[PDB]
Amino acid sequence: TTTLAFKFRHGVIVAADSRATAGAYIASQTVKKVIEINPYLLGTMAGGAADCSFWERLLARQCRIYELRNKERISVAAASKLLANMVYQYKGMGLSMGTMICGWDKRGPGLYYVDSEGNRISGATFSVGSGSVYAYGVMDRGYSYDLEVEQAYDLARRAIYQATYRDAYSGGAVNLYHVREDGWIRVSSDNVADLHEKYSG
Amino acid sequence: TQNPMVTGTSVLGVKFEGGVVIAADMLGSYGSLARFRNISRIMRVNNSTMLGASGDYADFQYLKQVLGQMVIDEELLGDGHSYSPRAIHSWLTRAMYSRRSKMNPLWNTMVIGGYADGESFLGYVDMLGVAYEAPSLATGYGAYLAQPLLREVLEKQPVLSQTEARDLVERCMRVLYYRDARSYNRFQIATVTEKGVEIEGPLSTETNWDIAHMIS
Amino acid sequence: TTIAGVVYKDGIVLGADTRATEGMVVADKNCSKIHFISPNIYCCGAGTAADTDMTTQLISSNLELHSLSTGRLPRVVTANRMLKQMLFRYQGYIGAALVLGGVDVTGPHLYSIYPHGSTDKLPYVTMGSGSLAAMAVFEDKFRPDMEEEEAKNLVSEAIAAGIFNDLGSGSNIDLCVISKNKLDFLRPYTVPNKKGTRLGRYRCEKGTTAVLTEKITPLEIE
Amino acid sequence: FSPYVFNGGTILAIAGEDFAIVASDTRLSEGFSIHTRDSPKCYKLTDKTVIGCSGFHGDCLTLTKIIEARLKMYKHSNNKAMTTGAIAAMLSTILYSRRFFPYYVYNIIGGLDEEGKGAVYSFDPVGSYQRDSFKAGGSASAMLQPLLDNQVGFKNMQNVEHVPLSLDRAMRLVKDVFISAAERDVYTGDALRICIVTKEGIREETVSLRKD
Amino acid sequence: NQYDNDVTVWSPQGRIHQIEYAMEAVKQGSATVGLKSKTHAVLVALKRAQSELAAHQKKILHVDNHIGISIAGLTADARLLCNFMRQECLDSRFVFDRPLPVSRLVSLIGSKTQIPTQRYGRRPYGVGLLIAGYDDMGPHIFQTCPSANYFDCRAMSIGARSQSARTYLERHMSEFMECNLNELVKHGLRALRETLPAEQDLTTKNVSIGIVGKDLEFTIYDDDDVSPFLEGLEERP
Amino acid sequence: TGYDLSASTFSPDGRVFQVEYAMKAVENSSTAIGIRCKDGVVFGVEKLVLSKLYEEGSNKRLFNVDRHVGMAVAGLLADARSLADIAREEASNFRSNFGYNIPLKHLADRVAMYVHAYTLYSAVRPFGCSFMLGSYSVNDGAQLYMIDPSGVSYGYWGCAIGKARQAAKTEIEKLQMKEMTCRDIVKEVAKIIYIVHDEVKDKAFELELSWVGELTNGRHEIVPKDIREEAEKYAKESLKE
Amino acid sequence: EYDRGVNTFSPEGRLFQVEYAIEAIKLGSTAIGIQTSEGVCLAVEKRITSPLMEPSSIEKIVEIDAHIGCAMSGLIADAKTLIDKARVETQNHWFTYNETMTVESVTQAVSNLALQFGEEDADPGAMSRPFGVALLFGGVDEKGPQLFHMDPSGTFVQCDARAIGSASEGAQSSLQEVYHKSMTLKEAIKSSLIILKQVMEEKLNATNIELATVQPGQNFHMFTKEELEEVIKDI
Amino acid sequence: TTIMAVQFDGGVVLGADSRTTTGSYIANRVTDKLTPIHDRIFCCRSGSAADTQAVADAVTYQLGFHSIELNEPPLVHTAASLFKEMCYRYREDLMAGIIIAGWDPQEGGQVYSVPMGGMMVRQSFAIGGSGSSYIYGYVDATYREGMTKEECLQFTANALALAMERDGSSGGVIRLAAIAESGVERQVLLGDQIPKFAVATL
Amino acid sequence: ERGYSFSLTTFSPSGKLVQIEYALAAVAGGAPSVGIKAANGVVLATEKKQKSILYDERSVHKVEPITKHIGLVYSGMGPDYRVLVHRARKLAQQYYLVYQEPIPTAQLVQRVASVMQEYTQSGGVRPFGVSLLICGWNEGRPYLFQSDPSGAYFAWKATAMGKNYVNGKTFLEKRYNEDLELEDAIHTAILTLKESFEGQMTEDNIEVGICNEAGFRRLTPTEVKDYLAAIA
Numbered sequence A: 001t002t003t004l005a006f007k008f009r010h011g012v013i014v015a016a017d018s019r020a021t022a023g024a025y026i027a028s029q030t031v032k033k034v035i036e037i038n039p040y041l042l043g044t045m046a047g048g049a050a051d052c053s054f055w056e057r058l059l060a061r062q063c064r065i066y067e068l069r070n071k072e073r074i075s076v077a078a079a080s081k082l083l084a085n086m087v088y089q090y091k092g093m094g095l096s097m098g099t100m101i102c103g104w105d106k107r108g109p110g111l112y113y114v115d116s117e118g119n120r121i122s123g124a125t126f127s128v129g130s131g132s133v134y135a136y137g138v139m140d141r142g143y144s145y146d147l148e149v150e151q152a153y154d155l156a157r158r159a160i161y162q163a164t165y166r167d168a169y170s171g172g173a174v175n176l177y178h179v180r181e182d183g184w185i186r187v188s189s190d191n192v193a194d195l196h197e198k199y200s201g
Numbered sequence B: 001t002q003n004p005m006v007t008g009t010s011v012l013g014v015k016f017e018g019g020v021v022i023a024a025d026m027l028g029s030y031g032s033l034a035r036f037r038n039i040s041r042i043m044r045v046n047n048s049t050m051l052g053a054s055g056d057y058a059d060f061q062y063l064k065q066v067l068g069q070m071v072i073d074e075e076l077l078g079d080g081h082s083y084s085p086r087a088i089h090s091w092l093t094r095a096m097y098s099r100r101s102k103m104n105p106l107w108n109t110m111v112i113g114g115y116a117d118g119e120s121f122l123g124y125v126d127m128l129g130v131a132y133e134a135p136s137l138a139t140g141y142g143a144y145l146a147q148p149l150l151r152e153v154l155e156k157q158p159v160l161s162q163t164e165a166r167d168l169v170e171r172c173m174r175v176l177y178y179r180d181a182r183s184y185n186r187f188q189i190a191t192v193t194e195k196g197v198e199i200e201g202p203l204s205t206e207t208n209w210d211i212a213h214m215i216s
Numbered sequence C: 001t002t003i004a005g006v007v008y009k010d011g012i013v014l015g016a017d018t019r020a021t022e023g024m025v026v027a028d029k030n031c032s033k034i035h036f037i038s039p040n041i042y043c044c045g046a047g048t049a050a051d052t053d054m055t056t057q058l059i060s061s062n063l064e065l066h067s068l069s070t071g072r073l074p075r076v077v078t079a080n081r082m083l084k085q086m087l088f089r090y091q092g093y094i095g096a097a098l099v100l101g102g103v104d105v106t107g108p109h110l111y112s113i114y115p116h117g118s119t120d121k122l123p124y125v126t127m128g129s130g131s132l133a134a135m136a137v138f139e140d141k142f143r144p145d146m147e148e149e150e151a152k153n154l155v156s157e158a159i160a161a162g163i164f165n166d167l168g169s170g171s172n173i174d175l176c177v178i179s180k181n182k183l184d185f186l187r188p189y190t191v192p193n194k195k196g197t198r199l200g201r202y203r204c205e206k207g208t209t210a211v212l213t214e215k216i217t218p219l220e221i222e
Numbered sequence D: 001f002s003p004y005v006f007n008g009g010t011i012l013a014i015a016g017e018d019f020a021i022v023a024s025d026t027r028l029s030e031g032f033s034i035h036t037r038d039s040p041k042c043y044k045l046t047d048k049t050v051i052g053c054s055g056f057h058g059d060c061l062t063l064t065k066i067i068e069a070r071l072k073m074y075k076h077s078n079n080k081a082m083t084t085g086a087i088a089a090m091l092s093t094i095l096y097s098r099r100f101f102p103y104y105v106y107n108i109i110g111g112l113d114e115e116g117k118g119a120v121y122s123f124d125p126v127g128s129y130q131r132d133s134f135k136a137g138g139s140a141s142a143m144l145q146p147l148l149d150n151q152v153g154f155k156n157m158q159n160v161e162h163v164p165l166s167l168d169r170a171m172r173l174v175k176d177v178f179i180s181a182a183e184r185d186v187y188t189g190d191a192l193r194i195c196i197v198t199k200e201g202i203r204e205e206t207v208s209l210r211k212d
Numbered sequence E: 001n002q003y004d005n006d007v008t009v010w011s012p013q014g015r016i017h018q019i020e021y022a023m024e025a026v027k028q029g030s031a032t033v034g035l036k037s038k039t040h041a042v043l044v045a046l047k048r049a050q051s052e053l054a055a056h057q058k059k060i061l062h063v064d065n066h067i068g069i070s071i072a073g074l075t076a077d078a079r080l081l082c083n084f085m086r087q088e089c090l091d092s093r094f095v096f097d098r099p100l101p102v103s104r105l106v107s108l109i110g111s112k113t114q115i116p117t118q119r120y121g122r123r124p125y126g127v128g129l130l131i132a133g134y135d136d137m138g139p140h141i142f143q144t145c146p147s148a149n150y151f152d153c154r155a156m157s158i159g160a161r162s163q164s165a166r167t168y169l170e171r172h173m174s175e176f177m178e179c180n181l182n183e184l185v186k187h188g189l190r191a192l193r194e195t196l197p198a199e200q201d202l203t204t205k206n207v208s209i210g211i212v213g214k215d216l217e218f219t220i221y222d223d224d225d226v227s228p229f230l231e232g233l234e235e236r237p
Numbered sequence F: 001t002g003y004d005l006s007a008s009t010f011s012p013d014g015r016v017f018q019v020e021y022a023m024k025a026v027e028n029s030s031t032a033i034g035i036r037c038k039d040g041v042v043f044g045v046e047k048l049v050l051s052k053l054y055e056e057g058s059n060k061r062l063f064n065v066d067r068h069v070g071m072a073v074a075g076l077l078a079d080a081r082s083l084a085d086i087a088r089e090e091a092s093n094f095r096s097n098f099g100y101n102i103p104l105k106h107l108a109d110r111v112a113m114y115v116h117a118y119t120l121y122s123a124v125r126p127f128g129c130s131f132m133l134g135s136y137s138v139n140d141g142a143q144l145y146m147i148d149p150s151g152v153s154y155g156y157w158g159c160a161i162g163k164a165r166q167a168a169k170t171e172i173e174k175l176q177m178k179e180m181t182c183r184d185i186v187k188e189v190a191k192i193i194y195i196v197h198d199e200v201k202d203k204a205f206e207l208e209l210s211w212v213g214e215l216t217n218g219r220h221e222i223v224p225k226d227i228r229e230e231a232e233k234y235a236k237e238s239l240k241e
Numbered sequence G: 001e002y003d004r005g006v007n008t009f010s011p012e013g014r015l016f017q018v019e020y021a022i023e024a025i026k027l028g029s030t031a032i033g034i035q036t037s038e039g040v041c042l043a044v045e046k047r048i049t050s051p052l053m054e055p056s057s058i059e060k061i062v063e064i065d066a067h068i069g070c071a072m073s074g075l076i077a078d079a080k081t082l083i084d085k086a087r088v089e090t091q092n093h094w095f096t097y098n099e100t101m102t103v104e105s106v107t108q109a110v111s112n113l114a115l116q117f118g119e120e121d122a123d124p125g126a127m128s129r130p131f132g133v134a135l136l137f138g139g140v141d142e143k144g145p146q147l148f149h150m151d152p153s154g155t156f157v158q159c160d161a162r163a164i165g166s167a168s169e170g171a172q173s174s175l176q177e178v179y180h181k182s183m184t185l186k187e188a189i190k191s192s193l194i195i196l197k198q199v200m201e202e203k204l205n206a207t208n209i210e211l212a213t214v215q216p217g218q219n220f221h222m223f224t225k226e227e228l229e230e231v232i233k234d235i
Numbered sequence H: 001t002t003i004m005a006v007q008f009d010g011g012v013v014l015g016a017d018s019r020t021t022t023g024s025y026i027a028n029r030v031t032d033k034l035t036p037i038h039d040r041i042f043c044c045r046s047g048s049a050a051d052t053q054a055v056a057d058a059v060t061y062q063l064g065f066h067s068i069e070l071n072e073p074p075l076v077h078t079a080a081s082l083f084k085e086m087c088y089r090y091r092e093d094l095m096a097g098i099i100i101a102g103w104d105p106q107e108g109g110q111v112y113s114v115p116m117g118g119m120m121v122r123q124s125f126a127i128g129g130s131g132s133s134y135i136y137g138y139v140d141a142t143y144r145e146g147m148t149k150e151e152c153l154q155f156t157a158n159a160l161a162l163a164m165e166r167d168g169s170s171g172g173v174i175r176l177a178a179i180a181e182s183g184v185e186r187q188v189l190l191g192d193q194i195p196k197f198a199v200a201t202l
Numbered sequence I: 001e002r003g004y005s006f007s008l009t010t011f012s013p014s015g016k017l018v019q020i021e022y023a024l025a026a027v028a029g030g031a032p033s034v035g036i037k038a039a040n041g042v043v044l045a046t047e048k049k050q051k052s053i054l055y056d057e058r059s060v061h062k063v064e065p066i067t068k069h070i071g072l073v074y075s076g077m078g079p080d081y082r083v084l085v086h087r088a089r090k091l092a093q094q095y096y097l098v099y100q101e102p103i104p105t106a107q108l109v110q111r112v113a114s115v116m117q118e119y120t121q122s123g124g125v126r127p128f129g130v131s132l133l134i135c136g137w138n139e140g141r142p143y144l145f146q147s148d149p150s151g152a153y154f155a156w157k158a159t160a161m162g163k164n165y166v167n168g169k170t171f172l173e174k175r176y177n178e179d180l181e182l183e184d185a186i187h188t189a190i191l192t193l194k195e196s197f198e199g200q201m202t203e204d205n206i207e208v209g210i211c212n213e214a215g216f217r218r219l220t221p222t223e224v225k226d227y228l229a230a231i232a
Ligand SMILES: O=C(NC1CCCC1)[C@@H]1CCCCOc2cccc(c2)C[C@H](N2CCCC2=O)C(=O)N[C@@H](CCN2CCOCC2)C(=O)N1
Pocket: A001, A019, A020, A021, A022, A023, A027, A028, A031, A033, A045, A046, A047, A048, A049, A050, A051, A052, A096, D122, D123, D124, D125, D126, D128, D129, D130
């Protein structure tokens, strides 16, 4: 798995690969690793597929309840804190989750990394999963806060592509989302075979 | 039960036209020691259902107690409903699975024979809650030594007569005596027919040792 | 540790050494191992010292309540039953090995009680790391219905065997003589060992120790 | 004491435009012995939904009973039968409820969605699940899946007209892949139970496989 | 008075007034009839509408494939009891893989509803039940009461003005065993109609039916699904 | 006058009026009789049929509480069924703990103490039922016990509970049951039930018969249908003449 | 008074506390729900008690879920627990089954709490008395638009048009006089506002009433002051 | 430890050695392993001393209360059932092999084995403890039906003597108890009263 | 059943806990008891009249030891007193188990009074219908305390309880003297009992206990006989 996210002038970019494995066997190439919590709030999944899916679904339920009770969408920070407190109860029991919570709230774009080990940190760029080091290299060399939207799309696509090239446990298709002030949009889904064709002549 | 203490060896079962037959030797072994040589490992559950058990004998006695009390409780109501062999098999499957899930299993493999509504029932339940039905069954070493003979015969002859099934189980018990070091040449044969459940007591197989002279 | 007890013609004699160690270093030279249970019942303790102390204190207090309510002298069998049922409840995790001895309306009684809650009723018993040597003395010399002085000498010889042959036992010999008409708590009964005389003088004269700071706080007296 | 044992079993599901096939082998094994040759791994849940379960047979039995009970309770409380997607979501929650003492079961649900199109949901033991056009699970899944990728998904094939999968071709493919699996996976064999879900209902078919 | 407020107070006459008041709760409800033949068990419930714009309250509920019930009295207590019955049937199918026999379910209901009639601060369940079931002994109609007593009936009617229905059923019960399903339902409908006032009449809106049988899982007919059964019904006297 | 509202309150005369009121509930019920003979115990019940709508055998007042123990009840039927469940649990638990059939006297004592526990508190009310327990065993003979709402348990040779207990007792006292068999006693029980039945007030009734004895090999069971038909014929013939 | 327990039946077979709680309903502000083919319309008189009060703080219509709204009448503070239970119910249903709960199921789950009160054999957290509020659940599920009425007794029923609260008698009579099954959502909104204007005491204006709708297309929608003004102008 | 019980017409004969060891140290050489549970019901204990003492005391209490309640002498089978329930319920925590032998008026003299694990079986004769392994053959060869009480006492004494000669964990004196309708007669064989079998020489 | 959770002792409009006053009425109707604190000990005496000669007067004692150094007596209801004696012995043993020292008399009195107070506020119980005189010896000093049904306790030099206790207190005021020794205190206590005694006093009609350095002990009938012969 390789997921990445970064804030820039025009919002938040979120990209992921689509491969899921069981041991060395490739269980799937079409897994959706970007959870749509609400129209302004996205979660990403890395690690145990069942753990991430279940706990981010629980997060979506709690966020909806919060909105119903308080007549306002939950903030990104509050949502990530909810998730972190939920998973802290099971520390050391074997939960495997590395999640990015990405949204746009009253404070602007928000990007938090939350994992089952207990970390919860805000940041401008993150990458999670077995292929995250490879993606970090490319994203760091290409990242500026003032990227144009299409430049940002290209950066995310290329970072995920390189990660799938080097990491045995990443592959399938790059799924790309853009969180803006008026909610996120699914940008695209490009198979890495097509990208390999595009990035090599 | 984490550690079985006194245990019973294979239990055999065979369906036949109009009933079911089950066989079990009368031995409780304490490790290698043939400690208790006159114990019954077959129980009549009710007029249509019988049960034979291998594995820990104290667990079998407990299960026999609980099943006997259940059958008594049902008979008290006198409402014209009685547990079928299938219902008892399902109940035992649930009991075994529940105990396994608590990591406190009942260390038994059970063969449930029965005859209700003009149909034979032969069910298997092991200590993990694995259960199924089959024309013939054998627990423990029987699974390796008896089941092939039963299944050869039934594959070539799906429906047996009571006499044929009885001869078959006798042959299987003789093989188990020859080759299972925890076996004993004293066994019971329980038969369930429309007439009910009949447990025939201490039987022995005739053995042959001519190959002992075939030593060079 | 060596503790022992015997039944003699008219009562019980209990005995103990007075050494307590931590590892292979003597912590207490004058440990008292014979514990009051009731005026007619005593208990020597080996094993974990805190466990022995607490268990015997608890049973002594419970027996005191029982005697207050009944208005009768407690029975040794009651003490044994309470101790053994508690120890069994704790499945041997209370490391108390005990020699319980007393005289009640039914005569003298001696029990050995083991940490797991098993008990034995016997005319003589030994316990502790020095138990085997004391038991050798008993097997060699015990006779039924000894007189008080013979029993005292026998128990003393047994404890001495433990003292001189077991590294875990040492120092003094304490005895407790129980009869229907008396209780003699003899502490110490014998002192076989003594520190040698100090040949030299190592007296630190005043001013020998250098001092950085000093503070004298006067205390108001009545 | 181990609370688990592997009893074999290979299951397969294929979603069509207006059908879903769920197939399984009927062998029940343990260690190197065969408990029985007549233990199909498919269970009808509703007129539109079938489930295939393989793995630890004790867990398979218990889980299927729990699912049946949940379906009946849903029908009682909501006055309608559960859809295939609702069943998949519910099953995910049931499996995760044992996240720290898992059901050792691989599940594939094959049915019709509310639009009448074939839907296949694939599950892992702790409840991770996704919708697929086709999926294999159990002992021979690694043998079955690549051939389905090639023949249903047309992967790695050029100059091939991607054409919708007809029921007849799907049946032939199911039978052929199970025949190939029976040759190489010791656990797979003795018979092939196929359940075809259409709006007409659930039809059942059985095909012999080799017995060694 | 001092004897008519708690279930734990015996009156000097040997009665428990709170239980009788719960009986009244049942007697207020809308009529429902149950009857059976050698092969079928039928419940027919007259449903009330609180207002001309409101739907009629459902009176027949599912319990299991082989068991349905008709309720009369407090509907929340009815739902409590129905949920308990459903869980009992589910437990039976889970443990023994067989349908719970109807009589055993009724016995369990009896125990459950008797418990509160003896404990301080508790109240009786304020609902009467007609239970239609089919099992190995054939079809069954049972009647359960707030007193926790239950009865095994050839036919029964409970609810307001149910005495007229009981009169009809007593008159005609000789014919029920050898009735086909259609005639059985028609007899049930005539009995239920006897409870109606002159102005009111049975329609497809205020009638619900429930049928269970050997080859027929418990099915509830409402609205136009009732028209086939009402079509052959004659005109009341 | 305020003293009769809770079982935890003595009246100034030392009576517990709630128990007496429960006993009145028992007294307003149709009668049941048990008779102990040399060979076993026979129970008869005058089950009043309150409408022809009820299936024959509805609201049975004879129960099997154990293979060897039968129970006949009078009073609040729901309370009686609760006590029958208690008795069954007691017998099953006794078999589980001690490994043999519960003696009838011990079972009666246990159930009587359960009944008594409900006579001491404001939290609960006394049971509104009286009942008889009958058993027969080779080792113990035939045993017949009766328990009432106060929890008092006594062994009897002949017992009647219900609204016609005194007349039924007068009739039972005419039999020399100590030297009779169950076969004659069933006829006598049917006759007594028919005699004490009030034909005007009580309308119609079913006769419920059960027994436990040597002829049943110690198992309590309903009397066979032919035996009951003979017994009812005898009772009607005795009435008519 | 305390002469009786909360679970005491009257000689007429009714629980005293439930009947008293219904009497309490009859003191609430009037609410009206109308169910049509195009959706459900809920309306409720706000009953402003002082010009210093802020009308926007009077919440008589609340969103249970995107497709379910609830109007309430009676002791409004009691309604909060029921509303929260309904919201948690719909979200639990979505979490488990990945689908939207039907209006009838939500109403049933709420009604299951009505009689869950008592004193003895009750753990802490147990309710001591019934809820003194009546609810109109309006929503849109696969079965179209649905209007349900629940009262303190736990009885719930589907309704085409229902009035609850103090003036529910005249409101119900007028609703019967005006309702037909083919009426449009605009027609229903106008009729409900006319009935409210009739039964209210203060002059009906855009601040002293609440109006929401649920439609198959749009989610639960609360009318703004300008939409309310437009509807009121044509009355 | 070696424990034995044998049924004879009208009663039972129980026997035990008297050795209690901790490792290879003999903590008690005159142990009494035959415990009266009731007037005519005894148990022979083998295994952990603490466990068998606790279980026998609990059973003694339960059985005495039961007998008082029923007003009748307890059945040997009832005592065996109580022992079985305790030994099965706590089989993971107890190390106790019990032989329950006694007389009651209903079934005469009875012997029941309750070995480790908590099963229960009636037997014509039972042996147990570490030393019983060494006498199985002997008992199987020497036992015969219809033995009188005197013959059963001699048989038990011989069997225990052999076990004691071979088993390091057995020894001391032989405690015997005969139980019949008339009551319990206890005796101790020690020293030269213990049956002797010569050690083969050359 | 489970017990009632509401208090049966509540405040009246006048500010009185009337159940406590009624328990005190029960105390005032009890058999007379007397305590005298001497320079070197304490004497507790109490009338022990049996209803008939059939009563085995030496089977139940009114003067009870709590610990080697603490004894007590009561006026009021006997069974309540047995409850409090059992509680006091338990409390003393718990103190000894924690501190390995005999509980001081004041500490024992405070703990017992705490229990008695608890029975004036807890749900579904009445107060104890007894007043206690607790005598003790510690720190080389004698202690005499009284503890009431309300849970209030007082330290006394001499006091009387039970029937006719006001006259007894006046008599003790006249006779008492701080300097008198233990034997003179015993004589004075017996004389105080004589004032309110019906019929002739014997060693079997009254019970006496004494606490001093040696400890608390109930006097024997022979010792009481000697003291009575001296009193005449
Ligand atoms: O790719 C994956 N994560 C990416 C995809 C989504 C988010 C990122 C993981 C990668 C494996 C590491 C996770 O560690 C586990 C933690 C808990 C439980 C299990 C595994 C169970 C099981 N285990 C456990 C070890 C052996 C085995 O096989 C297993 O690996 N399950 C697959 C399920 C994924 N698919 C199947 C269902 O259908 C949809 C997709 C799975 O979790 N993969």
